[PDB]
Design a protein around this ligand. Structure first.
Ligand SMILES: *[C@@H]1O[C@H](CO)[C@@H](O[C@@H]2O[C@H](CO)[C@@H](O)[C@H](O)[C@H]2NC(C)=O)[C@H](O)[C@H]1NC(C)=O
Lengths: 982, 148, 647, 47
């Protein structure tokens, strides 16, 4: 057994292809050796070494012992790999890093940082007598007995969470203690406050050890709730302040609305008012508020200005994950364009403080951002999409664009840029002038058959590379790469028409716009692009482009996508390079309103090109004086507030819209041009009415020797080939308290047989990225999970996959890691937290209810509605239960009215048992509030079943024995309520 | 440019995208044309009739009135309560992105409608040519340029 | 017979204040002399010059400080390599070709931590001194090179006080992991460079803590058959790991800098971690019978690399640990000479002071040392001396010897060994040495030595040196002459009267702060008459206490063995004079570093403990060039400074 | 013209990495790693 592996290792000890044998021998009980080798893209020798070591390793692993397996991993794991720099401990930031003038004697007092650390203070004196390294003095900040608690990132409302913690006793002698919890209103605990924070049960920690701590809680309210933990000992008392983040059920969905304020109609029609209506979505999670933020910035570039200059973050594309070098460049895009605006237009007086220091700060952030991509550069000055992966023609072109633009304000290394450009034109430019991709990275999915898709992708890549080379040409203006630019421009000129998509047509038009703008074929391409223009209004208020050609699809999209904004952006930049000022104003209005709170758009490419369009346009047109009186108020509610916007302040902070009324943003006679964006955040219970561009399936399994299996497959659009998707993202939300095995995920990306190209775990999400998801068959990520802490009433999680550059091509699915049913009953006490905020059915045929208590509860000013219904259908949707009922007799209506004998929907949290409703039975239901939805073309009302919702069973006949008397008093109340009007 | 002959013969239901899209009034010879007038389907196609919700703006107040359309080929008989209005779609773009209506009265007015989502610019321009031909020098109103 | 002696550093340093000494003899009437640094070889341009007066009031000795201005030298393609040192007077005019270096000053790069994780910010400052160990106040350029050799950032800053604070270097969110290099340099005039290193490692969350504890830090002859190793492991919630699987692999390593190692698949012994502790024993002999080696005579100064993998049994999690290397030690002792020039003076007893240290380079006391020696005279007739034996002094670690050799001896090949009662003959320490006789055509020799070197010289005391010449022409020597050098600059010079009523006479030298941390003393007398004047010289190396010129001291009030988090505390700084002070507070756990006084005496152009094959070699090994009308026969191509010899 | 001249990355008089100058019509590119000193590059046309 040892020799059978010594031969293997000895065979590949100094082999050229050595890693392929290593990760070939790695365990994969889900795929055969040939299936794993089918993904290898490093050549035949790597495939044969991989296949050999895979087969031999699989034969030796038959009927092994754990010692034999581990010893084999010792032989393989040492001789073949090299090393990797990593550290197991974190070291806090140093401090006291200052210089002082010491007049022979100087004392300075401060406060030691909050940490358990042996600090080392070092002084170095400099004077005309030389240097003096003083004796290093030690200062050990140490705590002998202390409590720490592990609070999860988020917790879904209604879940019963076990909060684990530990008390540490480093003293050599054991001791007594007790930890108590601080009761906050929204956090329901099984015990009850004594005096108001829990109880002290005295326990003992043994000397030089620890003791476990557990606190079971159940959050009833959404939001961030403070919880304190007190550790008491015969030597003192410590308070540990903590915060629990409670998240709603269901999926978060985010919609955006944009409005441009032009009070004097300088760039178009006058625009002084706009009304953002309050509309409740269909599947809104009950008892959750519809959030929406309002951002009113000063200029077309004002949103990006606020994004960069306000340092509370911030990424304009937080919904897209990091991992690709494209993300590292996009990190420096906004700072770059802000700097370009401030410097080219000389608008440094916007700062009320010293402008030179602000230009300094932005220059530094620009440089630091520019270093972020250095990791993705290879030795030959090429760039790889994925760190350690193969060099990409595409990403090298993009890096040459960003670097070439940044070089204007922060000079870039000319020799490096030269070597990169030469890497492009010397290797991956064909005779016909087009460029080819080296790696398997597919940034975009295009239409047509395999040959037609090949032509389209060739045109797109050539135009993209041309843009990069043009943007970085002045750094290294070589005749060789200018000749290359001539050949590529010729390819674009001859092969663009006839067009196959408005997208490739637009990017080709912009790439050619960066060169000779007098060539006749370029003018023909510009005409064909103008022919595809869509307009809103006549005379047009808006002008935009759909990425599909008209002759292939005549339908007009109702909402924007990333391809829409990217095509429109390429066309806008092409028109700006042509100085076509009559044509761009509706495009600028459309791109400005399609912008998003934060400054970004849908994906990365559309974002950068749209930012360049808005910024270049803002520098090309006259800067108007800014002076408006902007009033935001609700229609049928009080005025929210108003501010006077001037050039002094116009990047004002956002404002949350809490009230459930329609918003109205208005301004009087004004000078300037402001932007008003509203971001609506809701939480929905379903995803059925959303278009799914992926077949999804996900399960948890028990394994031999719990594991998540998440499979996706691409659904090709019309005229799309079966080759599969482009750059894809598999985002797996983990349930509360479920933790993923990071070793399995490493094993799926680190190898030559990698299934995924990058992975990360962020905020309870397992985010994997991928070059392509197949159309022919399913692709599955498989990784083990374990239970970190106990969770009762576990809320389901989400499984989302989407194209990185087309987030609109997505599919979201709910899943749970727990099989747990049944939910029959809660049995007595240890109960009040689950049944806390939902309804309790009255006692069946209970005659003690005294008809006046049935009227006073109905006439309560808190109780909005109150009437008698008959249930028609039961339904269980995800985490809630819907009851279809018929509205029989109306007894009260405070708010909106519903028609008699119309269909009324009820909803209760599935995790509520004592409100069990039987289909076909009548009930008297009285409660607070409702939801008014617009379904089909008519209204619909949905009523949640919570606490203070009085429900009672109501038989129709009178053969219930003594319930004859029951219905008598019931009909007594029913008769008295409507004849009075309390 | 191109040729503006589109959608022959003219069908009103086809000109209305079979009741799946909303249309906005962009040109009208009616001096009392409502500001920001947008028509959207308010129901399904039952028999030859079709519910149509009409939104518009008076001053700074938004208003909506329900109407019913009776479609007969190219002719449309719109009505609300007792008020009736006879119209005939006299031109419809090739992709049904815009159309030109002719409303009947002593001085028959001509209107131009287009998809609220937008339309192909060449087809929108063709509809504009047709309306300018029919109006024949009369003053045109632009209800969508009223700060909508 | 009249003579003149010009003493200068072996090399001229651009921008440095170079002190040039002139000492003339035989002249009774006063006269002036011009010392000059001019251009080579035309002497058209005068980089600098100074006038010195020589009189009876002056004892016919004077000094002049010259400076080669950096701006007076061309730049780039054909830079200056040599200058002319010239002395002109009524009596003589002599010049010499002197090499120049553009290395001036010191640039110490100080980063707050040596290891960083992503998104952290590197705090970095530079201490910049000139050749005279004073705030350089020169603008400085910092360059950052990543592990792939790419220059990724450069920033220059002017220097006001000698401490240069740079903006913090932000580590990228996803950086290039490995060894980063910082290079400091001056923007103008000079070629001085400073260099620091810092690693960027990726943080990985550990499941538990694994510790390896070897029996000793070195492997001697007693543990060559058995070496105990205790492997402990505990969870980070302060509980011992109950059960785990321990796998240990052993390797042989050349040096700790190189990450190369030779594994031994024979000693892959596996054990069980029970209740937190496991233990194994490594039979070095048997395992190193693999990979050749075989014996303990080999493996000496090589290392034993240890790798351990611990697989906890409950959750199946695995964590690794490693010991980089345990140096195999063949002898518990190492020998080195102290204050014993490897040069013989015929007629003077030759002293040898051996010094014994342990594996930690600590002075071991009470160690007997045996000294053997062979002698070769002018007739090539070899003689084996009788062995001598001393015992290591335990006050200073010294083991002293005094040797009486025949006057005709020329070469002394002496060998020293340790004589420990419990060590085999192989495990003893042995060192060989060869000493060559001072060569003089007039059989004239000089030997200086200052009472004795223990304890080290403290600034403020006095150095009572003994000057013993052995020669003919003894009672016609008028005076003795001396030059005191430190940090590559002649700090003192003078002449003492020779008493006709003794053989030796004590020359007293007050030890000053200019002499910290080391100095060199050159003493010489002039043998005159017919033929040609001869300089008879000797030199000694003076190790002086490392004492700051402006002493810094920091204290924490209150003083306590441990503090509590968030505690308000006062730091007291005290200096001898008004001084700038750069402070830092670093988590000591990063160190698992710098010493300036040793890197500072790289400017000492001298080598060895003193002495020389002849006069010119005595001046050369002291870091000096000289101009003389006397005999100046030196070795060949002797223009660059000496290089300290290693063994 | 100017394509036939040589260019390289050498050390300064004072120990600086420097790129030599191609003639008055070309520009120099040092193929290879950036830390390799000295290492000859090739001269290139301009336009
Ligand atoms: C949790 O502990 C914090 C810190 O002690 C409490 O915050 C303090 O509350 C008191 C009144 O209870 C105030 O007088 C202090 O000003 C507060 N300090 C800070 C920093 O906010 C907090 O009230 C505790 N919460 C609960 C639920 O017990």
């Amino acid at each position: 057994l040892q020799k059978k592996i010594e031969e293997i290792a000895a065979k590949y000890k100094h082999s050229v292809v050595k890693k392929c044998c290593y990760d070939g021998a790695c365990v994969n009980n889900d795929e055969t050796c040939e299936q794993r080798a089918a993904r290898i893209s490093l050549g035949p020798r790597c495939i044969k070494a991989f296949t050999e070591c895979c087969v031999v390793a699989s034969q030796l692993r038959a009927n092994i012992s754990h010692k034999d397996m581990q010893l084999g991993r010792l032989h393989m794991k040492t001789l073949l790999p090299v090393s990797k720099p990593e550290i197991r401990s974190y070291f806090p930031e140093s401090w006291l890093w200052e210089v002082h003038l010491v007049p022979r004697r100087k004392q300075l007092q401060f406060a030691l940082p909050d940490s358990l650390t042996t600090w080392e203070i070092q002084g170095v004196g400099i004077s005309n007598t030389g240097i003096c390294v003083a004796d290093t003095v030690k200062a050990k900040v140490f705590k002998d007995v202390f409590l720490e608690m592990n609070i999860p990132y988020s917790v879904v409302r209604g879940e019963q969470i076990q909060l684990k913690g530990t008390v540490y006793n480093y003293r050599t002698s054991g001791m007594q203690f007790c930890v108590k919890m601080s009761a906050v209103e929204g956090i329901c605990t099984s015990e009850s406050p004594v005096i108001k924070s829990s109880k002290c049960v005295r326990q003992k920690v043994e000397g030089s050890s620890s003791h476990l701590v557990t606190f079971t809680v159940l959050p009833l309210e959404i939001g961030l709730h403070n919880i304190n933990f007190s550790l008491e000992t015969w030597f003192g008392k410590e308070i540990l302040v903590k915060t629990l983040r409670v998240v709603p059920e269901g999926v978060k969905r985010e919609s955006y609305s944009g409005v441009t304020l032009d009070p004097r109609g300088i760039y178009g029609t006058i625009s002084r008012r706009k009304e953002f209506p309050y509309r409740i979505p269909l599947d809104l999670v009950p008892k959750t508020e519809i959030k929406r933020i309002l951002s009113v910035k000063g200029l077309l570039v004002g949103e990006i200005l606020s994004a960069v200059l306000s340092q509370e973050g911030i990424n304009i594309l937080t919904h897209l994950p990091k991992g690709s070098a494209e993300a590292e460049l996009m990190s420096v895009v906004p700072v770059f364009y802000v700097f370009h605006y401030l410097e080219t237009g000389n608008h440094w007086n916007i700062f009320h403080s010293d402008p030179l220091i602000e230009k300094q700060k932005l220059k530094k952030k620009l440089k630091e951002g520019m270093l972020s991509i250095m990791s993705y550069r290879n030795a030959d000055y090429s760039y790889s999409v994925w760190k350690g992966g193969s060099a990409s023609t595409w990403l090298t072109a993009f890096a040459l664009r960003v670097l070439g633009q940044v070089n204007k304000y922060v000079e870039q290394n000319q020799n490096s840029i030269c070597n990169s450009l030469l890497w492009l034109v010397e290797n991956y430019q064909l005779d016909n002038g087009s460029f080819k991709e080296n790696s398997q990275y597919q940034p975009i999915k295009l239409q047509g058959t395999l040959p037609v898709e090949a032509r389209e992708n060739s045109l797109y890549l050539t135009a993209f590379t041309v843009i990069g080379i043009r943007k970085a040409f002045d750094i290294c203006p070589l005749v060789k790469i200018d000749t290359a630019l001539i050949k590529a421009d010729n390819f674009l000129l001859e092969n663009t028409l006839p067009a196959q998509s408005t997208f490739t047509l637009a990017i080709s038009a912009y790439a050619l716009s960066l060169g000779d703008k007098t060539h006749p074929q370029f003018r023909s391409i510009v005409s064909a692009l103008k022919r595809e223009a869509l307009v809103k209004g006549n005379p047009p208020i808006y002008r935009f482009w759909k990425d599909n050609l008209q002759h292939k699809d005549s339908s007009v999209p109702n909402t924007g996508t990333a391809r829409m904004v990217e095509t429109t952006a390429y066309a806008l930049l092409t028109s700006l390079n042509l100085k076509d000022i009559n044509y761009v104003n509706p495009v600028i209005k459309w791109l400005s309103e399609e912008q998003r709170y934060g400054g970004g758009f849908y994906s990365t490419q559309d974002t950068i090109n749209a930012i360049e369009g808005l910024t270049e346009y803002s520098l090309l047109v006259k800067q108007l004086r800014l002076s408006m009186d902007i009033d935001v108020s609700y229609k049928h509610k009080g005025a929210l507030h108003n501010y006077k916007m001037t050039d002094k302040n116009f990047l004002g902070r956002p404002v949350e819209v809490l009230l459930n009324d329609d918003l109205i943003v208005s301004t009087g006679f004004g000078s300037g041009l402001a932007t008003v964006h509203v971001t609506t955040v809701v939480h929905k219970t379903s995803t059925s009415e959303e278009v799914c561009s992926f077949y999804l399936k996900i399960d948890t399994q028990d394994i031999e020797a719990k594991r998540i299996v998440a499979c996706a497959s691409y659904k090709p659009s019309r005229e799309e080939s079966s080759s599969g998707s482009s750059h894809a993202v598999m985002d797996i939300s983990l349930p509360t308290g479920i933790s993923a095995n990071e070793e399995d995920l490493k094993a799926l990306v680190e190898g030559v047989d990698q299934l995924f190209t990058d992975y990360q775990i962020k905020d309870g999400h397992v985010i994997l990225q991928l070059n392509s998801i197949p159309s022919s068959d399913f692709l599955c990520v498989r990784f083990r999970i374990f239970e970190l802490f106990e969770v009762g009433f576990l809320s389901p999680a989400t499984f989302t996959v989407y194209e990185y550059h087309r987030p609109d091509k997505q599919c979201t699915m709910f899943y749970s890691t727990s099989n747990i049913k049944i939910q029959k009953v809660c049995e007595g006490a240890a109960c009040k937290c689950v049944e806390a905020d939902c309804g309790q059915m009255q006692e069946e045929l209970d005659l003690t209810i005294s008809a006046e208590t049935r009227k006073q509860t109905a006439c309560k000013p808190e109780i909005a509605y109150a009437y008698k219904v008959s249930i028609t259908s039961i339904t269980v949707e995800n985490v809630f239960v819907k009851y279809k009922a018929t509205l029989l007799d109306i007894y009260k209506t405070g708010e909106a009215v519903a028609e008699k004998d119309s269909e009324i929907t009820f909803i209760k949290k599935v995790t509520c048992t004592n409100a069990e409703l039987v289909k076909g039975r009548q009930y008297l239901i009285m409660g607070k509030e409702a939801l008014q939805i617009k379904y089909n073309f008519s209204f619909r009302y949905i009523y949640p079943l919570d606490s203070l919702t009085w429900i009672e069973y109501w038989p129709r006949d009178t053969t219930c024995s003594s319930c004859q008397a029951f219905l008598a008093n019931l009909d007594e109340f029913a008769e008295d309520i409507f004849l009075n009007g309390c | 440019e191109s040729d503006c002959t589109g959608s022959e013969p003219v069908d009103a239901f086809q000109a209305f995208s079979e009741g799946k899209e909303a249309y906005v009034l962009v040109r009208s010879t009616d001096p009392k044309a409502r500001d920001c007038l947008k028509g959207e389907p308010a129901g399904e196609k039952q028999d030859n009739t079709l519910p149509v919700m009409m939104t518009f703006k008076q001053g700074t107040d938004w208003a909506s009135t329900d109407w019913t359309f009776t479609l007969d080929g190219a002719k449309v008989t719109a009505t609300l309560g007792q008020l009736t209005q006879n119209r005939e779609v006299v031109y419809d773009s090739q992709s049904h992105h815009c159309h030109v209506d002719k409303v009947e009265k002593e001085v028959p007015d001509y209107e131009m409608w287009m998809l609220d989502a937008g339309g192909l610019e060449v087809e929108v321009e063709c509809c504009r040519q047709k309306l300018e031909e029919l109006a024949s020098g009369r003053n045109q109103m632009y209800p969508h340029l009223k700060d909508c | 017979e009249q003579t003149y002696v010009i003493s200068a550093p072996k090399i001229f340093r651009v921008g440095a204040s170079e002190n040039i000494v002139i000492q003339v003899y035989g002249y009774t009437e006063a006269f002036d002399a011009t010392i000059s640094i001019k251009s080579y070889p035309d002497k058209k341009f005068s980089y600098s010059s100074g006038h010195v007066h020589l009189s009876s009031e002056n004892k016919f000795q004077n000094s002049a400080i010259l400076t080669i201005q950096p701006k007076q030298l061309p730049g780039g393609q054909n830079p200056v390599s040599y200058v002319y040192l010239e002395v002109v007077s009524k009596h003589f005019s002599k010049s010499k070709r002197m090499p120049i270096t553009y290395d001036n000053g010191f640039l110490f790069i100080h980063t707050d931590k040596p290891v960083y994780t992503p998104d952290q910010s590197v705090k970095v400052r530079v201490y910049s001194l000139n050749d005279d160990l004073k705030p350089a106040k020169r603008e400085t350029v910092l360059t950052f090179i990543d592990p792939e050799g790419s220059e990724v950032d450069m920033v220059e800053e002017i220097d006001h006080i000698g401490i240069i604070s740079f903006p913090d270097f932000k580590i990228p969110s996803n950086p290039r992991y490995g060894m980063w290099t910082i290079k400091a340099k001056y923007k103008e005039d000079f070629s001085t460079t400073g260099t620091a290193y810092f690693e960027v490692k990726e943080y990985v969350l550990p499941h538990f803590s694994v510790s390896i504890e070897p029996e000793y830090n070195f492997i001697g002859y007693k543990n060559f058959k058995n070496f105990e190793i205790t492997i402990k492991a505990r969870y980070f919630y302060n509980k011992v790991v109950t059960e785990a699987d321990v796998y240990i692999t052993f390797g042989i390593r050349e040096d700790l800098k190189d990450d190369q190692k030779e594994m031994m698949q024979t000693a892959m012994q596996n054990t069980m971690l029970i209740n937190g502790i496991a233990q194994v024993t490594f039979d070095s002999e048997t395992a190193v019978k693999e990979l050749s080696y075989y014996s303990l005579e080999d493996l000496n100064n090589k290392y034993l690399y240890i790798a351990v993998t611990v697989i906890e049994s409950t959750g199946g999690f695995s964590e690794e640990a490693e010991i980089p290397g345990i140096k195999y030690v063949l002898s518990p002792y190492k020998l080195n000479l102290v204050a014993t020039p490897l040069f013989l003076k015929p007629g003077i007893p030759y002293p040898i002071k051996v010094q014994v240290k342990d594996s930690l380079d600590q002075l071991v006391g009470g160690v007997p040392v045996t000294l053997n020696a062979q002698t070769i005279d002018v007739n090539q007739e070899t003689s084996d001396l009788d062995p001598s034996k001393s015992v290591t002094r335990v006050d200073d670690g010294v083991a002293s010897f005094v040797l009486n050799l025949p006057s005709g001896v020329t070469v002394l090949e002496f060998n020293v060994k340790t004589d420990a009662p419990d060590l085999p003959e192989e495990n003893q320490a042995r060192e060989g040495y060869r000493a060559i006789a001072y060569s003089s055509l007039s059989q004239s020799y000089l030997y200086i030595d200052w009472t004795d070197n223990h304890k080290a010289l403290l600034v403020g005391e006095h150095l009572n040196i003994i000057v013993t010449p052995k020669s003919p022409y003894i009672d016609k020597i008028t005076h003795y002459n001396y030059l005191i050098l430190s940090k590559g600059k002649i700090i003192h010079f003078g002449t003492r009267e020779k008493f006709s009523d003794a053989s030796y006479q004590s020359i007293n030298i007050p030890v000053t702060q200019n002499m910290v941390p080391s100095s060199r003393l050159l003493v010489y007398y002039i043998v005159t008459g017919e033929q040609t004047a001869e300089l008879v010289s000797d030199s000694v190396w003076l190790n002086i206490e490392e004492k700051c010129g402006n002493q810094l001291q920091v204290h924490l009030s209150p003083d306590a063995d441990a503090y509590s988090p968030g505690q308000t505390v006062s730091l007291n700084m005290a200096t001898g004079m008004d001084s700038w002070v750069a402070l830092a507070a670093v988590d000591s756990a990063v160190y698992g570093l710098e010493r300036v006084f040793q890197f500072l005496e790289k400017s000492d152009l001298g080598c060895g403990a003193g002495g020389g094959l002849n006069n010119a070699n005595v001046f050369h090994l002291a870091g000096l060039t000289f101009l003389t009308n006397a005999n100046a026969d030196d070795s060949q191509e002797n223009d660059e400074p000496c290089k300290e010899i290693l063994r | 013209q100017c394509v036939n001249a040589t260019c390289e990355r050498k050390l300064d008089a004072l120990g600086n990495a420097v790129i030599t100058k191609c003639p008055q019509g070309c520009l120099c590119v040092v193929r290879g790693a950036s830390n390799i000193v000295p290492a000859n590059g090739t001269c290139f046309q301009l336009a």
